[PDB]
Amino acid sequence: TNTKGKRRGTRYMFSRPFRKHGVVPLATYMRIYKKGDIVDIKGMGTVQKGMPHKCYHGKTGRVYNVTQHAVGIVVNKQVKGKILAKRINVRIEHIKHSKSRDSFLKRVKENDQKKKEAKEKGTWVQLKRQPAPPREAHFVRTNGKEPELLEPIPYEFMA
Amino acid sequence: GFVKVVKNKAYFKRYQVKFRRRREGKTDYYARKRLVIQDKNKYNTPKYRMIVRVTNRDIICQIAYARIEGDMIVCAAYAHELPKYGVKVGLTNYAAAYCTGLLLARRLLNRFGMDKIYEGQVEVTGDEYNVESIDGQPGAFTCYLDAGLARTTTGNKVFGALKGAVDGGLSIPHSTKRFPGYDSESKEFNAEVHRKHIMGQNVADYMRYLMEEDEDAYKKQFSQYIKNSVTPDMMEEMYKKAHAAIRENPVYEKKPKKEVKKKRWNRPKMSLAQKKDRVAQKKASFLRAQERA
Amino acid sequence: GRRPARCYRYCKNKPYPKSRFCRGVPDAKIRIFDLGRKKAKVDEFPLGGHMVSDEYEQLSSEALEAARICANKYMVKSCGRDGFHMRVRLHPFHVIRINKMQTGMRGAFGKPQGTVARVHIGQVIMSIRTKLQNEEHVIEALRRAKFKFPGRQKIHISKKWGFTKFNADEFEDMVAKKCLIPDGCGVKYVPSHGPLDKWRVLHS
Amino acid sequence: KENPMRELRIRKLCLNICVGESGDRLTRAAKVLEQLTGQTPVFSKARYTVRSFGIRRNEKIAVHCTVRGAKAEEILEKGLKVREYELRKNNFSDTGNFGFGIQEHIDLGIKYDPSIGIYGLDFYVVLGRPGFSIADKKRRTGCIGAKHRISKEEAMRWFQQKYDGIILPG
Amino acid sequence: AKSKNHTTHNQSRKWHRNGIKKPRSQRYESLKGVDPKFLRNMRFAKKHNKKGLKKMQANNA
RNA sequence: GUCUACGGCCAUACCACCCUGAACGCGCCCGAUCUCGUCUGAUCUCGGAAGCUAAGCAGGGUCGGGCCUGGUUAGUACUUGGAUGGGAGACCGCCUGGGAAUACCGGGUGCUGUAGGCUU
RNA sequence: GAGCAGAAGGGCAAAAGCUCGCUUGAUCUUGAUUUUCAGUACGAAUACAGACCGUGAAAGCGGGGCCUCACGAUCCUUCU
RNA sequence: GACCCCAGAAAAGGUGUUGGUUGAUAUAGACAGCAGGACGGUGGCCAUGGAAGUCGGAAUCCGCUAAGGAGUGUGUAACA
RNA sequence: CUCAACCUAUUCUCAAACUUUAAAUGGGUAAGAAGCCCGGCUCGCUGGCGUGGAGCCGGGCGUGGAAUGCGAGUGCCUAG
RNA sequence: CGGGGCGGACUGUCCCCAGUGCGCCCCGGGCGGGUCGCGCCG
Numbered sequence A: 001t002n003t004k005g006k007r008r009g010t011r012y013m014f015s016r017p018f019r020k021h022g023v024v025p026l027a028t029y030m031r032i033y034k035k036g037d038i039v040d041i042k043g044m045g046t047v048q049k050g051m052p053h054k055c056y057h058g059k060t061g062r063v064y065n066v067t068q069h070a071v072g073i074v075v076n077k078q079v080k081g082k083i084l085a086k087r088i089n090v091r092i093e094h095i096k097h098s099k100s101r102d103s104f105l106k107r108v109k110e111n112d113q114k115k116k117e118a119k120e121k122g123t124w125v126q127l128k129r130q131p132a133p134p135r136e137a138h139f140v141r142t143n144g145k146e147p148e149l150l151e152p153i154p155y156e157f158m159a
Numbered sequence B: 001g002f003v004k005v006v007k008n009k010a011y012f013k014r015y016q017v018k019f020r021r022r023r024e025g026k027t028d029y030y031a032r033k034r035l036v037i038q039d040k041n042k043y044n045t046p047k048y049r050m051i052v053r054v055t056n057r058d059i060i061c062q063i064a065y066a067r068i069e070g071d072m073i074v075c076a077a078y079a080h081e082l083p084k085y086g087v088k089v090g091l092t093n094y095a096a097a098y099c100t101g102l103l104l105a106r107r108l109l110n111r112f113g114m115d116k117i118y119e120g121q122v123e124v125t126g127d128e129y130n131v132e133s134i135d136g137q138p139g140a141f142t143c144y145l146d147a148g149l150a151r152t153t154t155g156n157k158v159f160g161a162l163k164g165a166v167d168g169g170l171s172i173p174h175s176t177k178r179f180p181g182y183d184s185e186s187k188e189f190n191a192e193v194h195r196k197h198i199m200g201q202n203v204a205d206y207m208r209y210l211m212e213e214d215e216d217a218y219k220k221q222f223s224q225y226i227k228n229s230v231t232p233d234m235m236e237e238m239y240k241k242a243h244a245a246i247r248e249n250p251v252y253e254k255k256p257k258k259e260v261k262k263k264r265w266n267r268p269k270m271s272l273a274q275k276k277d278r279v280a281q282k283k284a285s286f287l288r289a290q291e292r293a
Numbered sequence C: 001g002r003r004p005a006r007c008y009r010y011c012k013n014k015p016y017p018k019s020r021f022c023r024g025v026p027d028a029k030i031r032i033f034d035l036g037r038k039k040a041k042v043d044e045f046p047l048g049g050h051m052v053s054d055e056y057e058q059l060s061s062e063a064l065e066a067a068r069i070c071a072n073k074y075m076v077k078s079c080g081r082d083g084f085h086m087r088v089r090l091h092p093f094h095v096i097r098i099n100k101m102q103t104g105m106r107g108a109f110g111k112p113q114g115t116v117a118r119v120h121i122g123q124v125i126m127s128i129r130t131k132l133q134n135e136e137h138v139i140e141a142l143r144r145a146k147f148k149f150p151g152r153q154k155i156h157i158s159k160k161w162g163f164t165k166f167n168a169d170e171f172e173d174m175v176a177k178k179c180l181i182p183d184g185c186g187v188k189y190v191p192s193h194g195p196l197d198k199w200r201v202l203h204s
Numbered sequence D: 001k002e003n004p005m006r007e008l009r010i011r012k013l014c015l016n017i018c019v020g021e022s023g024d025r026l027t028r029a030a031k032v033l034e035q036l037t038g039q040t041p042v043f044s045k046a047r048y049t050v051r052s053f054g055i056r057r058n059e060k061i062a063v064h065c066t067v068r069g070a071k072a073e074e075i076l077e078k079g080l081k082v083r084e085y086e087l088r089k090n091n092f093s094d095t096g097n098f099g100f101g102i103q104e105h106i107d108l109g110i111k112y113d114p115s116i117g118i119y120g121l122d123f124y125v126v127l128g129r130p131g132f133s134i135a136d137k138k139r140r141t142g143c144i145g146a147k148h149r150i151s152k153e154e155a156m157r158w159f160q161q162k163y164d165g166i167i168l169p170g
Numbered sequence E: 001a002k003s004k005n006h007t008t009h010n011q012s013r014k015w016h017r018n019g020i021k022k023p024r025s026q027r028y029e030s031l032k033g034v035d036p037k038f039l040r041n042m043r044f045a046k047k048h049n050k051k052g053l054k055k056m057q058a059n060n061a
Numbered sequence F: 001g002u003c004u005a006c007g008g009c010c011a012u013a014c015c016a017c018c019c020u021g022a023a024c025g026c027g028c029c030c031g032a033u034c035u036c037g038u039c040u041g042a043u044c045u046c047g048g049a050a051g052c053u054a055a056g057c058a059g060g061g062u063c064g065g066g067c068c069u070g071g072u073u074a075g076u077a078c079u080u081g082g083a084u085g086g087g088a089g090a091c092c093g094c095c096u097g098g099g100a101a102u103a104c105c106g107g108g109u110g111c112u113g114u115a116g117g118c119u120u
Numbered sequence G: 001g002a003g004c005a006g007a008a009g010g011g012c013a014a015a016a017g018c019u020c021g022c023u024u025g026a027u028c029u030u031g032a033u034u035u036u037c038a039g040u041a042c043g044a045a046u047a048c049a050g051a052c053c054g055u056g057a058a059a060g061c062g063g064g065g066c067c068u069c070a071c072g073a074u075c076c077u078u079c080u
Numbered sequence H: 001g002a003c004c005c006c007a008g009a010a011a012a013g014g015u016g017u018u019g020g021u022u023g024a025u026a027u028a029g030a031c032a033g034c035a036g037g038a039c040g041g042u043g044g045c046c047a048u049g050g051a052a053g054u055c056g057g058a059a060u061c062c063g064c065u066a067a068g069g070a071g072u073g074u075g076u077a078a079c080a
Numbered sequence I: 001c002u003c004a005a006c007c008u009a010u011u012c013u014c015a016a017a018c019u020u021u022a023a024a025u026g027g028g029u030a031a032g033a034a035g036c037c038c039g040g041c042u043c044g045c046u047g048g049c050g051u052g053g054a055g056c057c058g059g060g061c062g063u064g065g066a067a068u069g070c071g072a073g074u075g076c077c078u079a080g
Numbered sequence J: 001c002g003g004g005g006c007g008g009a010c011u012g013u014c015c016c017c018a019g020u021g022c023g024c025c026c027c028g029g030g031c032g033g034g035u036c037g038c039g040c041c042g
């Protein structure tokens, strides 16, 4: 029924954003990708070589191999009732560093520094995040101003 | 009107500008991508290039490597600092291009500390020379030429700058096809007329030719050559001494900063209140003139 | 020869416009959408009355034409030939198909039969603008035109001035302040931004 | 008062001779241009096939050459002598450069040759100011700005104030 | 004659009965697919790790 | 306070018209002997330095267009989940959470990296 | 708003289009991978590595066509 | 008439009754009934076989007035 | 003087195979001991460089770095 | 809700006509947050 074409249904997926066509900015070629870092596979359509398949657009993986123009990415793909880790070669135009790993590394560094500093200062500090707790008990001043009475409006036929 | 306005509102609503330096016409991004981008399996290894830019009155030779925040220039040499030694007039020519390329190479090599090793080619001959790395010593500095938007035909001054750099001791891949000595018909490199160009004997030949043909044209052409007392006989020796003096002391001494009053030569932006008041005044003047009738 | 409209009353399919994919569409029955004094200025007809559907349904171009003719006839009878302006504000852009009966439901996709206008709840079908003293005639003309349509419709006297999008109580002093400039049967809104030369053309 | 860099000058002359067909007629026209300018002319091929004109695509149809400098100034003097120093008002374009044509070339200052025909030709004087070449420059190319442009009125003024010509209102 | 053509009905229920398991990750993933030039250099580095052992233990002590 | 060379982001940077530009600089500009290209030294390449900021360029301006960012539109449209809710239906209301886009009205009009100059 | 052989979609401006110059990376090899997928094959494709080359001043780019289609087992035959 | 699916109904109507919205008249006398007047220029002009307020096309005024349309309908060939 | 076309500023109505903008629901990844931080060694890869990268050898860090719940991992044969 | 003294800049009221902004200092008014804060009340 449906064709099996490699770019079927990517009409908007691989298209460029509005007024963002043309020359690829060169910082994307200047990014440094090491083995073990987490990258999101975008898949821009200006460059056709090394393009990922449509099932990897929007997926995140870990770099395991670096070549001259591309990287090898171990990315999970779900095939029916099993998830299996595919290895795909993707040119660096179609990937970027995932910032979730950046934020986590920042938090780890903060935690390590705070633990080392807290042992020296003496007291104990909280390192785990916690879910948003129930709101505390507080007071609400009226400031001598009576709260405004709200009344539902009558119905009127706009147009 | 009778024709559709092409540059209407929708034209600007959909118009996408090019990169700023493409609009300024200063950068070929097609070449820049191929020329500044490092292989990914080389990681943070700097890729060095020798930018050569010829100006109406100057030659700028720089060595830079690309970074995400912007390019980093590690060594720059100018043709306007040539008058410090030897050569005083007739900059932005092929001989000055060689001199500033040699100066850039010597300055960078001195900064890195590789001068006793990689002395380059001191005795200037136009034949091809390529510096090779010495075992047990730090490797030869490798950089690639960046000509920019210059048309790279035989005899372009970017190749004189490159020749100066490679004789200064910088490993820059090149062929002799684009040097002034190359003959396109025979596909042969003379390497002697190229040396003449390096020593500026085409300019000296022009001077002494005008001395035979037209004296007033000679004055009008080389007016500043009569000043500074530069003559076709001493031209080659002037360039040779400039080469030697580049060799001995290539270190750049920045001129000390000056005490300067904070004078603003540019009109600042009008404030929002000023613009609104200007509109109010213009409306009031129009109404008052209408009442005057 | 035409099917009953109950067969195409509801918006069951996705919009099916006449396009390069849908070719050979017969022309809609309604070709005229403005009647009366279309050239009348904005200040002549300040009263506007709308027919508004309460149904999310499809109205055939034939029904739009019939209602247009009926409302026009009543308005001419009551307010004269030049005493009103009517605008039908539904265009039949949806194409309804027919699978005329190889054999059976094999290859059942139909050929273009006709066109309908797809109308939403609260959408205006027809508008009449006229003088203040013809409110009863406008209401009655729209009420008569309601009998040519399948669903339920309401007659609403608009709060706007005529066919504009500005309220009828502020229209006059906006025209006084030159925020509105008449142009034919409508008005042009003049914001307080742009070149001052345009402002100088006004006030002079 | 006026800046010396605003003085009008002749950029190029752009002589053109469009022959109907190829062959010897076009070769003779090329020889006419060679004699007039001392420059090798260049041929122009047909953009499309026109049945009515009997021309085919990529077929040598015209011959032309552009002249700059004192040679262009001299040839313009010759052509304006032929026109007798009067130009029509519509002959000046809105971009500030003008043109005219002649139908006989033997009175331009050339000798008749029986093997050579009687080809007429078109002169199109392109006017400019110092600094117009930034639009043609390779690096940092730009546009000349509004005040520096040449208008039709300034072109006619230059014609009158250089060749004491007459603008016929036709 | 005619019959149903395709459905994924009940397929997700079948998939989740034994769970949809993430691939078993572990230390030391395989070096398959890695750049052969890089790989043969790594093998040379591993081979010559043997030498310089006495300097390592001297520094460690 | 600025510019030049190379840039990063790629209009808050673009476009139209007007005004101002000290000093370096960047240019326009002068020429074709050599190098090198042309129908044309116009472009390109080369050798210059009489003139000029007229142009490019920089800065500023415009109840400027655009662009950027807010308000409004609007808790509207749409929407996750719920009911033995309503209604002949078409559809609609409520509960539980999420939540837009025009028109219209405001504010803004490049930030910045490396190297090197000028500015008493 | 043109063109890029063709259907359509995406992409593209000192491009990927047009005109020139030089060419044969449309070549010789081993593996890995992606797509359909049972994670079988074919086809097509991506990133490499080893040769030998082309072009360019060079950086580089090229092992067919800007990308998405343009195709074929066992047995037998034929050639190298 | 009488309970999800569900096992039968629509447009359109009602001076049946019940709520609601909006407007209007009225102790300067509403509404409804019964009872009086309902004129003059003027049988207004053009249409005509006759069209007089009443088949029609435009006009839609004036005086006396408490008030009256140069006419709401029935009716006449037209009047009445 | 009029009616067209054309242009300009507006105006009504639309799109499964249109789109600047753009949800809700949804898909991927991360939330550490295989980690973090110190020293050192190897390399035929890379190279201005004690460079870069990778590998390896020692050492030190436990507040076990969201919530909630649950014991997991793995192989063979296999019917319908 | 605003006042004093110096550099630019706008207006078709141009006779030291009128109006807007910026940098320094001298004051005046109101609002919010910390303050060994300080007292009083609960």
Ligand SMILES: [Mg+2]
Residues within 6 Å of the ligand: none
């Ligand atoms: Mg390809």
Ligand SMILES: [Mg+2]
Residues within 6 Å of the ligand: B031
């Ligand atoms: Mg190039």
Ligand SMILES: [Mg+2]
Residues within 6 Å of the ligand: C012, C013, C014
């Ligand atoms: Mg359907």
Ligand SMILES: [Mg+2]
Residues within 6 Å of the ligand: none
């Ligand atoms: Mg069945």
Ligand SMILES: [Mg+2]
Residues within 6 Å of the ligand: E003, E004
């Ligand atoms: Mg089946």
Ligand SMILES: [Mg+2]
Residues within 6 Å of the ligand: none
């Ligand atoms: Mg604006």
Ligand SMILES: [Mg+2]
Residues within 6 Å of the ligand: none
């Ligand atoms: Mg809701």
Ligand SMILES: [Mg+2]
Residues within 6 Å of the ligand: none
């Ligand atoms: Mg290879």
